[PDB]
Design a protein around this nucleic acid. Structure first.
Ligand SMILES: [Mg+2]
Ligand SMILES: [Zn+2]
Lengths: 158, 104, 105, 221, 14, 1112
DNA sequence: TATAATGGGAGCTGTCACGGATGC
DNA sequence: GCATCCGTGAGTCCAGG
């Protein structure tokens, strides 16, 4: 349950699934204590099964659960694990990675075979901790943090 | 020690409860007025762990000097908030429920 | 190398009473040919004040000594009834091609 | 239906209503059962709708206030030909209500939104994929705290171990808590005036070393 | 298969 | 300069209004200019008439509706992020059945969005376009059974979401089955329900061998219609009480209920045509006098059996024929959603009718507008067909409005689409363009409206054809559907015409799309134009006949993507279209009536017409587009100019004196160059930048909110802690950057301070505070700064505040500050250039002017394209365009070469000859003989069989020139190219994809919440995905530590990544990485799945990868 | 808290192709 | 012994909005 920039809240679908579960479990415990008829306890029991079903693999059996005012099935634990976007092939056979960049390729025929043309800007950010270290080595800055401050703005760069 | 195998096996309800740090009794998220977790709800710092490192919910214990200490007033152990990503809870069901994976 | 116009804060403006946008006016002013008769001279700030129904050309610049406009018929602006214009352009010696984004004058 | 809760959830709350009504019904009043049951059934369904339909749960009276404010604004718009401002609603709502209060009540009613709500036609795009994590510190932050801790040690070592220790206690860089002068003096075996005085001179020597070397200014932000 | 049809049947029993 | 035009084809009719597919559809749907009693039962009128009246008791009936006026005009909506929309009132009357009491009022439903003059919309302040949709027309189709070769599936299809698709099949056992809602039951049963006794079915289907016998089930005629109806209902609703009135309700609502079931007006017409019958309504059966009366079912059964036996006059239906595929324009999509919202409003009506005081009920209390509002809002905001408008350049918008998606609600999903869907059917001829489409996943689905094409009343695309009686081509021009034109021999628009007679003895024509040679006695119609066969973008490509389709496509598409240049130019080779497109896209300002010009200015143009009246036109000046291109207009007339009706008063974006200026005409040499034009890269002259060619203006919008908080207000102030006047130089006292300052990356645009969250100063902080003696301030700098690699000159500040008039923002925010920052973009290394023939590539090298290949007279070429592209890509049109470009360069004129009716090589040669005389007799008169280098190249070209040997140097240079080749002198050496080189004037465009917008790089940045991996995207200062296949790469290399660095130190690994950055800024080697946080998340997400996941050493004894924090 | 009220409504329509478990 | 029904899968990265 995260407060995004605007102050409004984002949340996960696993929350609404678990809540469904606790509500059907609590209502069941209370219909039991109050001695409710059979037919009713049967219905609460069935609905509770289906709430556990939806939390673990929503849409696996019968209907898929949705949030009100949307036809969009909720992300169950199974849909998190399994799938082209599921955790396995989304964050453990491939990840996003620090120290990377990207730009447009241009032919450089003056390069040797073992060479590439890399802009100054991409190079200053891709090598940035090194740049602070060696900026401290030579006199260019007192310490790491002063070097990072100096590269923060473009016009300060010398 | 060095990891050498990874095992996967069924969890017993005894084992589940052994993971769980507390039953989630109430389907409450956070209080609409303070934006803080509701006791025995899905984000209860009493179960899952503190939200600020080394500081308890109510505020009696804010420092690292207390570690493993549970506040008597609010019941939140004082450790690192990283634990909210690692601590299982549980929901104890009235009727047993099958696990659709081993059904469907 | 530089233009200041009165009541113009930046290049993407339009002056009321003037058909041309500032961008176009700098495109015209680039083509100005300004001859320095004195070799000591490095830099000149030409003034231009004009108004009324009139097609300002490069002759309308207030002339300076040791300075000669080699294309006085060069069109610059088309001014309308009540439309005014008060420029101060700075013109320098130099070599080759020095983009605006570099010389920052 | 269409009010936050599943049909079947709604029926089971109506069933709790039926139970209250059976246990409270008086045949002697000669009324049919349906008449008295319908009251407790409606009661139960409305209490459930007001108690569960919101992820972030809002007390019953407040939900009723929010809904009243809804219907007010709807009347106001259905007569104005347009939406109402906060001020028109604070009028038609009644006294005690100013525009500010309408605003804050709305800001409280703001439901959370899903992290899995897509942005694009493709499934490559969720809404969580744009929210950073402002809790776990950045490596820049942690490294800066490390360089701060080390430079603080470097400037503390130019002090004698007594004055370094007095300061490391009176601020709490050791054990996590800051002490009173009586504790630092009953530890060092010295008066509270004397331990406060060697804290003074420790701070003064640190201020002089800092006017000279300037190794700590960059961490004051 | 459709829980609310099933429950409407169980109810139409009594 | 003169504009000389080729071609002989006399196109009778002009291109119809090129946004009428939008404007006429919405006009049809709204009828906001029709007196209400004159409205027809269509559009939102018909939606009302469907949803109302509303019974049960009480009765609420619809009288009429009316649309008001916008509460804000178009530009003001755009500024304040509002929607352009008219208030919608409807008049209703409540009637009590018994009492008779009538209460009548005008309930206010909310607002309907209005469509701007150019056929677009403004939703939440952005321009958007509703793209038309293509789907299978309603009606009856017989398509063969793919398994059973002699048996056929009949199918009955309504409008989308207006009834279920119904199937009838002749089964292997002989009984005719009907499928609906996926239930297969004997049609016999529904026939009985309809009243059919074995008498009528026998005398109607007896003609067929045994097919009626499988319909003979005595146990069905043994029961009455009521008994058959309860039998069918038990078939269709297992486990539902077979109440008689409930079964009548359900089966009426399935088949006969016009409120629920609806073929189109088109589905209805096409059923009448296919089945040889008439329909009284748009349903399959009726409820009359208490029973069910057939309309469609017996005809469909009759046709199916007749096709199954083999009687003549019955065919299968081609389902991708454009006679059976129809367009749903904007009005139909919007009206559909309006019907949905209305239906919800009626469910709310009946709900409020049961409960609540049965006496004091007005319409105001009965109608809840909200459902309807949210339906319409939603369609215009998150529908797949509500696309963000493309205003790159004016042609982009004009083509957007004329797209056709097959996708969208109720059509196809990706990979629900086969081949036959995307094939270009024979019936696309004249309707849907066969080149313009996407290259990639959506190919064949998003398509484009042919130019002469228009959508008729029933939703079919129609094309014009001239009527040819006895080989006399009249001027009567007839717009046809596919199924209409399928009955006419239709000759091409190139067949020779001595006046109005077809002059050839043998003629090229089409019979049902098939090509056939044919006499003028047999010719019935003739194509209007060649322009008629292609979309607008493809009609903008001259010399198209010489272009393989594959690269004609990218030419087409990239024309959409041309940035407006400050100095844009109409091509030197045009097609006869570049003016219509400026005129219809509504970019350029025109003259309404004959009149003289009053006042001309950089912001206004006042005109005195023949009416005497003064009309002032304001000019859109430096406004920002959807895609950040600058959209402004410029005055093209001067004070007092007498201008006739339709004369040009102002040039818009990418418009040169009313012509479509999507780029520049540059001077081009087609020869390799040192590798700098290897593999479609491009080399340009620094004098391109000198004379400000390929230079655009782009304005980026930056925005910030200041909102109220539980810790205090975020406030917009100049007073920002720990900052110098160096930092606050160009910020005013409010904290807002001044108009006209230069902002570089890291510059504060708006100074915002927020109260610090409750912070426990870690002991280090307390001691540093005590050493310096400065209180920790209460707020922190949160100012809007300039992102990496952006910046420019500030040209606007919009500051909206709460507490200021007219301004009320979303709940919680105190104020919004928009900063509009513009930049004049020159052309740089990495920017993408392209031509109209498919040739695209990136600028790889900008050589100074003294290195450029130059001509004998000293003129340097502008761009050096590599010939190696041309052969592979079979797009020879650009070669011809370059030749005619040369001719026009020296003659100093432009040309108009119509597509398929253009300039031919002989005429290009005449022009080239004239130009050579201008080129070279200049030289002979100026007193210069044939240079030595021209000799060397001439001997070369002689050994190349390019000249005839022995002719004089002038004779031979003229010979070469006529081949579009000239002598060129390597600017570096002085020496001529070993041989002659093609040189000409070419239309090259700057595509939108500029390197300034794509260069991105991160050391470390923000991470994700659950995974703690970096975000993706430039805007988020993201990381680059290292997909599976990259891991496979690093694997096949065995770069194990490089791989493990990707998988831990640079992502997921939190302790390791923090230690890495420390080690680097320190000077130490990076630490051995530890367990990546995402594997912890996998652990825990499998626990939640009730699965123990255990990390073990070789002793099969657990390993705690959570370091105690999960064990109690 | 007391006339009496007693079984819901969507559905959604143009993939294609396998493997592998279940009925005459 | 064959159909028959079920679920499961269907290329990479990048931008916007
Ligand atoms: Mg009030
Ligand atoms: Zn506590």
């Amino acid at each position: 349950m995260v407060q995004v920039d605007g102050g409004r809240f984002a949340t996960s679908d696993l929350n609404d699934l678990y809540r469904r579960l606790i509500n059907r479990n609590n209502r069941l415990k209370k219909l039991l204590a109050q001695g409710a008829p059979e037919i009713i306890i049967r219905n609460e029991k069935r609905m509770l099964q289906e709430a556990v079903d939806a939390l673990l693999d929503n849409g696996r059996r019968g209907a898929p659960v949705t949030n009100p005012g949307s036809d969009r099935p909720l992300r169950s634990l199974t849909d998190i694990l399994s799938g082209k976007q599921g955790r396995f092939r989304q964050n453990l056979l491939g990840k996003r990675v620090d120290y990377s960049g990207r730009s447009v390729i241009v032919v450089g025929p003056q390069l040797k075979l073992h060479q590439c043309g890399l802009p100054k800007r991409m190079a200053l950010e891709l090598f940035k901790p090194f740049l602070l270290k060696k900026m401290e080595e030579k006199g260019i800055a007192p310490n790491v943090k002063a070097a990072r401050r100096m590269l923060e703005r473009q016009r300060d760069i010398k | 020690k060095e990891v050498r195998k990874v095992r996967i096996a069924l969890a017993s309800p005894e084992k589940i409860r052994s993971w769980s740090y507390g039953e989630v009794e109430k389907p409450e998220t956070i209080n609409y007025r303070t934006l803080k977790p509701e006791r025995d709800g899905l984000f209860d710092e009493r179960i899952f762990g503190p939200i600020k490192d080394y500081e308890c919910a109510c505020g009696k214990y804010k420092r690292q000097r207390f570690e493993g200490k549970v506040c008597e007033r609010c019941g939140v152990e004082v450790t690192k908030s990283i634990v909210r990503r690692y601590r299982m809870g549980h929901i104890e069901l009235a009727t047993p429920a099958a696990h659709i994976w081993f059904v469907k | 190398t530089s233009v200041y116009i009165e009541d113009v804060l930046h290049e993407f403006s339009t002056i009321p009473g003037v058909k041309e946008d500032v961008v176009e006016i700098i495109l015209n002013l680039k083509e100005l040919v300004v001859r320095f008769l004195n070799p000591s001279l490095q830099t000149v700030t030409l003034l231009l004040k004009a108004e009324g129904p009139k097609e300002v050309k490069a002759r309308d610049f207030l002339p300076v000594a040791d300075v000669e406009i080699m294309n006085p018929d060069l069109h610059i602006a088309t001014l309308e009834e009540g439309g005014r214009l008060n420029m101060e352009v700075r013109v320098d010696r130099g070599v080759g091609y020095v983009p605006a984004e570099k010389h920052g004058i | 239906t269409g009010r936050g809760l599943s049909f079947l959830d709604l029926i089971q709350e109506g069933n709790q209503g039926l139970i209250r009504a059976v246990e409270k019904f008086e045949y002697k009043r000669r009324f049919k059962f349906s008449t008295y049951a319908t009251w407790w059934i409606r009661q139960a369904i409305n209490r459930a709708i007001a108690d569960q339909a919101r992820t972030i749960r809002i007390p019953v009276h407040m939900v009723e206030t929010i809904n009243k404010l809804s219907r007010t604004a709807r009347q106001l718009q259905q007569e104005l030909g347009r939406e109402p401002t906060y001020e028109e609603i604070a009028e038609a709502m009644g006294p005690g209500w100013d525009a500010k209060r309408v605003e804050e009540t709305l800001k409280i009613a703001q439901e959370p939104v899903s992290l899995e709500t897509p942005i694009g036609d493709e499934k490559d795009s969720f809404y969580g994929d744009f929210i950073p994590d402002e809790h776990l510190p950045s490596p820049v932050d942690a490294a800066t705290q490390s360089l701060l801790s080390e430079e603080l040690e470097k400037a503390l070592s130019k002090l004698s171990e007594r004055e370094a220790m007095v300061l490391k206690l009176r601020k709490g860089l050791i054990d996590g808590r800051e002490h009173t002068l009586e504790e630092v003096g009953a530890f060092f075996g010295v008066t509270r005036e004397r331990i406060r005085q060697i804290e003074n001179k420790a701070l003064r020597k640190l201020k002089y070393h800092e006017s000279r070397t300037r190794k700590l200014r960059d961490f004051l932000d | 298969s459709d829980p609310v049809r099933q429950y409407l049947h169980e109810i139409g029993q009594v | 300069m003169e504009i000389k035009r080729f071609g002989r084809i006399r196109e009778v009719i002009p291109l119809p209004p090129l946004t009428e597919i939008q404007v006429e559809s919405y006009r049809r749907a709204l009828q906001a200019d029709v007196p209400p009693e004159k409205r027809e039962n269509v559009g939102i009128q018909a939606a009302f008439r469907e949803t109302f009246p509303i019974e049960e008791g009480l009765v609420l009936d619809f009288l009429e509706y009316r649309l008001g006026e916008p509460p804000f005009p178009q530009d003001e909506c755009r500024e304040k992020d509002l929607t352009y929309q008219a208030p919608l009132y409807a008049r209703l009357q409540l009637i009590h059945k018994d009492t008779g009491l009538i209460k009548e009022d005008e309930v206010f439903l909310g607002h309907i969005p209005l469509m701007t003059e150019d056929g677009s919309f403004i939703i939440n302040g952005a321009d958007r376009v509703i793209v038309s949709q293509i789907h299978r027309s309603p009606g009856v189709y017989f398509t063969p059974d793919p398994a059973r070769p002699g048996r056929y599936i009949a199918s009955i299809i309504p409008l989308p979401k207006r009834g279920p698709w119904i199937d009838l099949e002749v089964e292997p056992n002989g009984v005719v089955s009907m499928k609906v809602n996926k239930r297969k039951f004997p049609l016999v049963l529904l026939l009985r329900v309809l009243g059919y006794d074995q008498e009528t079915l026998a005398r109607e289907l007896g003609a067929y061998g045994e097919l009626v016998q499988g319909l003979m089930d005595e146990s069905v005629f043994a029961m009455r219609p009521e008994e058959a109806l309860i039998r069918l209902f038990t078939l269709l609703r297992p486990g539902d009480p077979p109440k008689r009135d409930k079964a009548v309700a359900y089966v009426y609502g399935l088949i006969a209920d016009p409120r629920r079931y609806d073929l189109g007006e088109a589905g209805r017409y096409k059923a009448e045509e296919k089945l040889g019958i008439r329909l009284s309504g748009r349903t399959l059966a009726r409820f009359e006098d208490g029973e069910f009366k057939d309309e469609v079912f017996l005809p469909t059964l009759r046709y199916l059996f007749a096709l199954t036996a083999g009687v003549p006059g019955h065919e299968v239906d081609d389902i991708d024929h454009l006679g059976n595929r129809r367009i749903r324009t904007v009005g139909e999509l919007m009206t559909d959603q309006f019907r949905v919202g209305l239906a919800r409003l009626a469910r709310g009506v009946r709900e409020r009718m049961l409960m609540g005081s049965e006496d004091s009920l007005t319409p105001a209390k009965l109608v809840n507008s909200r459902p309807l509002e949210a339906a319409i809002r939603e369609f215009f905001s998150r529908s797949q067909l509500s696309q963000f408008k493309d205003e790159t350049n004016p042609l982009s918008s004009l083509r957007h409005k004329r797209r056709i998606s097959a996708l969208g609600p109720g059509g196809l999903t990706r990979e629900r689409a086969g081949f036959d869907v995307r094939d270009v059917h024979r019936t696309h001829y004249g309707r849907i363009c066969p080149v313009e489409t996407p290259e990639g996943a959506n190919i064949g689905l998003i398509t484009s409206l042919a130019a002469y094409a228009r959508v008729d009343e029933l939703g079919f695309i129609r094309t014009p054809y001239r009527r040819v009686v006895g080989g006399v081509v009249t001027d009567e021009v007839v717009y046809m559907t596919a199924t209409e034109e399928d009955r006419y021999t239709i000759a091409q628009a190139n067949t020779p015409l001595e006046g109005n007679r077809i002059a050839a003895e043998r003629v090229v024509a089409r019979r049902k799309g098939e090509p056939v040679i044919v006499s003028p006695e047999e010719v019935e119609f003739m194509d209007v134009s060649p322009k008629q066969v292609f979309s607008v973008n493809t009609n903008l490509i001259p010399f198209l006949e010489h272009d393989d389709a594959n690269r004609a496509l990218m030419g087409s598409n990239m024309q959409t993507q041309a940035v407006p240049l400050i100095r844009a130019q109409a091509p030197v080779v045009m097609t006869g279209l570049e003016e219509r497109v400026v005129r219809d896209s509504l970019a350029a300002l025109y003259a309404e009536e004959d009149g003289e010009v009053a006042k001309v200015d950089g912001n206004r143009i006042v005109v005195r017409y023949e009416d005497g009246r003064l009309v002032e036109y304001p000019l859109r000046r430096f406004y920002r587009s959807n895609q950040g291109t600058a959209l402004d207009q410029r005055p093209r007339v001067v004070v007092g100019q007498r201008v006739r009706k339709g004369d040009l008063l102002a040039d818009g974006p990418a418009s040169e004196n009313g012509f479509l200026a999507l780029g520049q005409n540059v001077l081009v040499a087609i020869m390799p160059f040192d590798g700098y034009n290897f593999e479609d890269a491009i080399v340009i002259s620094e004098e391109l930048l000198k004379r400000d060619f390929y230079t655009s203006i782009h304005i980026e919008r930056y925005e910030i909110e200041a909102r109220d908080t539980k810790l205090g207000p975020e406030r917009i102030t100049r007073d920002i802690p720990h900052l110098s006047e160096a930092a606050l130089r160009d910020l005013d006292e409010e904290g807002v950057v001044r108009i006209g300052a230069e902002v570089k990356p890291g510059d504060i645009l708006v100074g915002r301070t927020s109260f610090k969250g409750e912070s426990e100063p870690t002991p280090e902080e307390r001691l540093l505070r005590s050493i310096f003696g400065e209180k920790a301030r209460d707020v922190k700098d949160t100012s809007l700064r300039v992102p990496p690699g952006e910046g420019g000159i500030v040209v606007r500040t919009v500051r909206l505040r709460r507490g200021d008039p007219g301004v009320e923002l979303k709940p919680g925010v105190r104020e919004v500050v928009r900063v509009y920052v513009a930049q004049k973009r020159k052309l740089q290394v990495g920017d993408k250039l392209a031509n109209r023939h498919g040739n695209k590539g990136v600028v790889a090298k900008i050589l100074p002017v003294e290195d450029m290949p130059h001509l004998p007279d000293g003129t340097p070429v502008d761009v050096i394209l590599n010939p190696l592209g041309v052969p592979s890509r079979m797009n020879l049109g650009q070669i011809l365009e370059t030749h005619l470009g040369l001719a026009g360069y020296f003659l100093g004129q432009r040309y108009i070469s119509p597509i398929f009716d253009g300039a031919k090589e002989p005429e290009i040669k005449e022009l080239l000859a004239q130009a050579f005389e201008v080129y070279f007799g200049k030289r002979k008169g100026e007193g210069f003989g044939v240079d030595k280098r021209e000799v060397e190249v001439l001997r070369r070209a002689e050994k190349l069989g390019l000249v005839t040997p022995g002719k004089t140097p002038e004779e031979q240079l003229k010979e070469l020139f006529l081949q579009g080749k000239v002598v060129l002198y390597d600017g570096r050496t002085g020496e001529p190219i070993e041989g002659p080189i093609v040189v000409g004037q070419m239309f090259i465009m700057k595509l939108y994809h500029m390197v300034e917008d794509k260069m991105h790089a991160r050391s470390t940045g923000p991470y994700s919440l659950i995974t703690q991996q970096p975000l993706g995207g430039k805007a988020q200062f993201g990381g680059q995905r290292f997909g599976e296949m990259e891991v496979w790469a690093l694997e096949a290399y065995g770069a194990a530590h490089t791989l493990q660095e990707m998988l831990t130190l640079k992502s997921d690994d939190i302790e390791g990544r923090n230690a890495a950055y420390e080690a680097i800024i320190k000077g130490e080697d990076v630490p051995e990485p530890s367990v990546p946080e995402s594997f912890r998340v996998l652990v825990k997400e499998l626990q939640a799945l009730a699965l123990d996941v255990q990390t073990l050493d070789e002793k099969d004894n657990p390993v705690d990868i959570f370091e105690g924090l999960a064990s109690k």
